[PDB]
């Protein structure tokens, strides 16, 4: 027939894009950053006052 050199083609820019995920709960959650220096000398713990009764 036509015996010639073969190639293998990879369409690199054509990704398949298999996964889609959503993050509702962490979006709705509060985000707190205490001072870092004080956090280190604690066990990474901050105490928060509760509303008084």
């Amino acid at each position: 027939a036509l015996n010639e050199g073969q190639i293998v083609t990879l369409a690199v820019d054509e990704i398949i894009e298999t996964i889609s995920a959503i993050t509702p709960m962490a979006q709705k959650a509060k985000k707190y950053t205490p001072p870092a220096a004080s956090m280190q000398r604690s066990s990474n713990t901050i105490w928060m006052p509760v509303e008084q009764e």
Binding site: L10, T18, I19, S20, A21
Partner: protein, 376 residues
Amino acid sequence: SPTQEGWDLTDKATGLLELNVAVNMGEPDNDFFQLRADDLRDETAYRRRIQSAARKLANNVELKVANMAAEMGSLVITSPDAIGTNTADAWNFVADAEEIMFSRELNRDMGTSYFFNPQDYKKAGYDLTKRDIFGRIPEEAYRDGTIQRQVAGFDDVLRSPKLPVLTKSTATGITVSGAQSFKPVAWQLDNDGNKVNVDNRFATVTLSATTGMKRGDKISFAGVKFLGQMAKNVLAQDATFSVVRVVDGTHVEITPKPVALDDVSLSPEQRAYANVNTSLADAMAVNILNVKDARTNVFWADDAIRIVSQPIPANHELFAGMKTTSFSIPDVGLNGIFATQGDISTLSGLCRIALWYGVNATRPEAIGVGLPGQTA
């Protein structure tokens, strides 16, 4: 990608793993006939046959798309009873499809389409008209036969006339043979130490028997559940697989490759591609999901199936004798060649309409089939 925890990751760095999928091509589809010169005095049959050829080729393309989708669709939604048995079972059935697509974290950005067969579409319409005809939706389901064009979370709900019938599987008591693990690999070594690409889709399973199994059979394994494809959280739905090919009396190829989370033989970047909770055990039972002969419903994400086509260079100068033109296939958006050639000895001519294409299921995990009334 995988993740570690904590500090001090020394000697725990991973590698990079890039999986890949191949799309190939089929055999050319032809319409080919011959006529003697005495049959060309009246050419009406000739022209009508050419037009019939165009129509048949187009509908063959459509049939191939439908059959590939139904055979390769891993996502199996089943229901032990027919559509119409209950007040929202058609909506329930489409919503089951949508919910499994969502929980699996499959990509649906290009859109989602749900294809009913005419019978199940009529049963959905029946469900709608059994309510009070007050309302735009029941009024359209009554005056017309149409359920709404968007149902549950699906962006396109249609009625497909060519959806195949899934004949019931006769396999009974099928079990795995020995523990089998399947590893995500980009390539592998053959002889001569060449790196050869590996298709990520399929996996070969050794079973106790493959007697009543066929292409398109929907199966599951006892205790094997799906995972959220990123969060890797165990789902309530048993992992479903479709049979691609029965290659032996004890080997079957299934279109989603089962990568287990608990497999200790996987690297972290291999385990990052896990889709089932546990691996295939030795004597673990095989569940047969097409238990009753039924006509199928197909749903996908829109990019899952593609048609790949190639030109047929019959208009080259190397084909001087035969007369070739371009043949337009009406609806499916494909182009073929129309060639004619006559023989002086027999005073007869040949007519060949050739079309070359190939249907490819790039994401068989994003293609699903719905089987209602699967009882006993």
